[PDB]
Design a protein around this nucleic acid. Structure first.
Lengths: 177, 75, 136, 50, 116, 43
RNA sequence: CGACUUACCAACCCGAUGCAAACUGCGAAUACCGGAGAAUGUUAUCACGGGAGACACACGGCGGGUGCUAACGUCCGUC
RNA sequence: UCCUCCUAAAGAGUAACGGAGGAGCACGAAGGUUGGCUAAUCCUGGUCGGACAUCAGGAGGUUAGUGCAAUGGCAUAAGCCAGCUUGACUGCGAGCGUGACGGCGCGAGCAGGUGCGAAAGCAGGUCAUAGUGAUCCGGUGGUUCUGAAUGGAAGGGCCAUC
RNA sequence: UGCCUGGCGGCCGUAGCGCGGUGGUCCCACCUGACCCCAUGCCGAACUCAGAAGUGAAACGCCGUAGCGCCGAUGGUAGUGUGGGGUCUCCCCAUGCGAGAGUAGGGAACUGCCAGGCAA
């Protein structure tokens, strides 16, 4: 919630001045974040979903929902109805809190960290990234987990193009490496 | 291996526009919905169109999709 | 040997050749071989005419085929009684109406096309004539 | 016709019964649907029976 | 779109009322100024309308878009219908849940003499 | 906001080696041991 | 980890030309159903009752399947 | 034998040892009602993940889907999800379609008693069209209808069903 | 009466898309919070509730623009009813009906009931 106060206080002015808009509310805003991982090994081992949801619930502030295959594909031997992944969506104040728990004490602890990619952008105002291990999250400490499973983070904004989308990211001081 | 066929079900329109009909008369026999029931016309489970009142059957077009409707005018 | 690939149905009704041609104008090249008679051309006939022209021009200019067989034709085996179902497909033919443009030429001298088309016409069962690209 | 036929007997004293079909192996459980009983003119529970 | 979703949701009821050929009470709900109208079977004429926009109805409501406002307009339309002579009407959700203000309007009409 | 289905979200304070102390809500546990943060890092 | 060329294969598309009994974003002429009106026809119409025969059809015109757009061939619709 | 299209000539019907395909089921839910939602195929980004898994945005507008072949239909959705349920109910049924007939199909409405919904209302199985077999002879249950001197029963009859 | 807006209709692509401009006194939308009603097969997203700080981007309404979709003649052609003829696997004549496509052009809507604000 600190950043939301940080966001409401001055960076809005900085965005306003930088983009010389005719109104403040044209400035983009973050509406939600989503977590996901298409494990896909549910057929091989069905009872891994429980831990898959449990870890994400610990990482996030609420329970996940398990998605289902949209269609039938012979290449992966899966059909609609059989769960293959789970996800969460964060919006409101919980999203604000999660973001700080990400930027503060998640990126620095990336194993063999080199730099956050900047070319990762859809082209409309949404940013996506992935992780390799849960260690960046304090809820995991190598004792109650034994899986190298990863996940993905997608942040969506009210931005209209890359230029203002990247500018908002720069305002939030992303690593930009 | 060919030569099989099914006996004709005699579908189509049984009463045409401007024709006075009695209540319960069948106006159209159809598989889907060629025509949609309007005022005083009911649609059966077979999509058959029957008149719920005595009058003259009228055809017209309504709706954004220019679908064809059948109604009965009490005149 | 022009032939449709993976046609919807193996056999089709004989139909009729009534009506009038549609592609009656030269639109691709500069010279065309219009057909004034009525009939059908087999794939074998179309191939023979095409070979005659490409060689007559001696690998020069462009040639377009404006007709495709796209119609299976059946034949009963010899010494087979009538009935017992439709016959098998042996060759494909195209339906040609008067005024249809069959072959079309470009990038060649005006005279050379005339003999080339004349040679091709000699190997077809239908009346044909020589036409030029009209300005609209 | 792998699906076979059954008989539903009204729980009431009257002998009125309905008939239907179900798959024994898929759902070997009994059927306790509530259906109209013309003899008594009430809706009562019908128990599946041979 | 929010608007497009409502019409699609309410279309089934509208068509059902139309073919039944009965007077319908249609309610439009917004963050402020809930609206209510009574439409004749033909659909081209409106018998009575009520809402909080009228100064004659808003001079005693502290806020517009509340249960009290919903009840007040519900009573206003109810008595307007009674004096106009119309008695039987069919309620229309217009794509709105029958949970809050819509419910608060419906019962107010029902207890005010507009049973349906 | 559904109840009795989500994990605990109690507020907990955490500190790192470089002297920065903050407070976050999560199911991390009882105490936190950190070495680096967003700042005070070889970035 | 950046990046680039192409004498060479080619998808999705765009322009132009066609084809289809089992394609239709279009669509007749006739035929058929219903209403009104005049003329004309030995009620030519319908219903009920007594008696039947017939239920191997042929050719011609038109619209088709089949055959080879062969048959005084074969199988349908209509006259 | 039955169902889909074509042949079939713009009502219906219409043959061939004419051209293509299916059916002899399934489902107490996939039925009823209420409430809600809206696909295929592509483009950009993104751990394993790569043409093709899941996630976010956009293009697209039914090319999806609809228990089963085909045709026709279906955004009010007949398509997808959930709650509560048994109207897949009994006795009738004006009036129609369809056949030489046996027969088959549609059906508002009335009575009794139910389910869903605040309510208007909807519900007499399933998006529709195949999933079926006459009569005889017999079996099981109900009903003093009958029961050959009378009182019973046997056996028939009626209703339900195999 | 007029400028405007909201609701329910008639008619439904001449009515729909694209591009540009414009709208906040009312209304509408976004928006603030949600301990309670209510809701997420997780999420104040949606749905619902309490409010109004802000605002007219989005969305929506209005205006402009033909860039598309769309509408569309007259004439000619195809086809065809009836009656005739022929070099009769096809076509012609007399007569009646007359497309489809395309061209000129039209076109970026009109209108009914109710309530409100503004200006008269």
């Amino acid at each position: 919630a600190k950043l939301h106060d940080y966001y409401k206080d001055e960076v809005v002015k900085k965005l306003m001045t930088e983009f010389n808009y005719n109104s403040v509310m044209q400035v983009p805003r973050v509406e939600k974040i989503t977590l996901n991982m298409g494990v896909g090994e549910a057929i091989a081992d069905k009872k891994l979903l429980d831990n898959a949801a449990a870890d994400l619930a610990a990482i996030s502030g609420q329970k996940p929902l398990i998605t289902k295959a949209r269609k039938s594909v012979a290449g992966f031997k899966i059909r609609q109805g059989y769960p293959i992944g789970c996800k969460v969506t964060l919006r409101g104040e919980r999203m604000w809190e999660f973001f700080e728990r990400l930027i503060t004490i998640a990126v620095p602890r990336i194993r063999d960290f080199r730099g956050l990619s900047a070319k990762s952008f859809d082209g409309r105002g949404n940013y996506s990234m992935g992780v390799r291990e849960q260690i960046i999250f304090p809820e995991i400490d190598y004792d109650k987990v034994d899986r190298v499973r990863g996940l993905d983070i997608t942040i969506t904004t009210t931005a209209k193009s890359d230029e203002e989308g990247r500018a908002l990211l720069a305002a939030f001081d992303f690593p930009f490496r | 291996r060919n030569g099989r066929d099914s006996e004709a079900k005699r579908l189509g329109v049984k009463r045409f526009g401007g024709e006075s009909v009695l209540a319960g008369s069948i106006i159209v026999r159809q598989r889907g919905t060629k025509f949609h029931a309007g005022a005083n016309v009911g649609c059966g489970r077979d999509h058959t169109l029957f008149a719920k009142a005595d009058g003259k059957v009228k055809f017209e077009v309504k709706g954004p999709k220019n679908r064809k409707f059948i109604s009965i005018e009490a005149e | 040997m022009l032939q449709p690939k993976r046609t919807k149905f193996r056999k089709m009704h004989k139909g009729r050749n009534r009506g009038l041609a549609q592609g009656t104008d030269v639109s691709f090249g500069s010279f065309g071989l219009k057909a004034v008679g009525r009939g059908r051309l087999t794939a074998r006939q179309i191939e023979a005419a095409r070979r005659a022209m490409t060689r007559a021009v001696k690998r020069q200019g462009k040639i377009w085929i404006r007709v495709f067989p796209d119609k299976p034709i059946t034949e009963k085996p010899l010494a087979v009684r009538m009935g017992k179902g439709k016959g098998n497909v042996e060759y494909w033919v195209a339906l040609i109406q008067p005024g249809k443009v069959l072959y079309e030429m470009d990038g060649v001298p005006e005279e050379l096309a005339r003999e080339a088309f004349k040679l091709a016409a000699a190997k077809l069962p239908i009346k044909t004539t020589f036409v030029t690209k009209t300005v609209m | 016709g792998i699906r076979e036929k059954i008989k539903l007997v009204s729980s009431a004293g009257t002998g009125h019964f309905y008939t239907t079909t179900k798959n024994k192996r898929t759902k070997p459980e009994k059927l306790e649907l509530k259906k109209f009983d013309p003899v008594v003119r009430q809706h009562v529970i019908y128990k599946e029976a041979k | 779109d929010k608007k497009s979703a409502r019409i699609r949701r309410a279309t089934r009821a509208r068509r059902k009322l139309q073919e039944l050929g009965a007077t319908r009470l249609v309610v439009h709900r917004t963050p402020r100024h809930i609206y209510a109208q009574v439409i004749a079977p033909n659909g081209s004429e409106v018998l009575v309308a009520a809402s909080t926009v009228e100064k004659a109805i808003a001079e005693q409501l502290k806020y517009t878009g509340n249960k009290d406002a919903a009840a007040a307009v519900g009573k206003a339309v109810a008595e307007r219908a009674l004096e106009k002579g119309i008695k039987d009407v069919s309620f229309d959700r217009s794509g709105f849940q029958y949970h809050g203000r819509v419910q608060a309007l419906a019962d107010a009409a029902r207890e005010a003499g507009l049973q349906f | 906001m559904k109840k009795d289905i989500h994990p605990k979200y109690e507020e907990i304070t955490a500190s790192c080696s470089c002297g920065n102390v903050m407070k976050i809500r999560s199911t991390v546990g009882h105490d936190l041991n950190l070495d680096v943060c967003s700042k005070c890092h070889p970035f």
